[PDB]
């Protein structure tokens, strides 16, 4: 289920979420623990999820550093995440 998420730094704080990289069977940008009150929680982010897009940039096979870079570059960017896209991997 392709989910949509828009992160915008309206105040002066990050999004509130982390990201991890998957194995070789399914490499990509995953979502890690998130902090409450931040934008991440406001959008409905959490561990297991998997970002498959960010401001147009396909995160299907985007490098880990690339994900953090683009996310760090633009404070406010639209990120397309798909539920279970990462949970499958987490289930180790």
């Amino acid at each position: 289920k392709e989910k949509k998420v828009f992160i915008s730094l309206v105040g002066s704080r990050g999004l509130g979420c982390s990201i991890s990289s998957g194995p070789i069977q399914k490499p990509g940008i995953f979502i890690s623990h998130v902090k409450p009150g931040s934008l991440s929680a406001e959008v409905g982010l959490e561990i297991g999820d998997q970002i498959v897009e960010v401001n147009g940039v396909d995160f299907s096979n985007l490098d880990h550093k690339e994900a953090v870079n683009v996310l760090k570059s633009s404070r406010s960017l639209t990120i397309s995440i798909v539920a279970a896209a990462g949970r499958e991997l987490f289930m180790t």
Partner: peptide, 8 residues
């Protein structure tokens, strides 16, 4: 081993 993680 656990996968790399980053804080945003």
């Amino acid at each position: 081993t656990p996968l790399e993680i980053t804080e945003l």
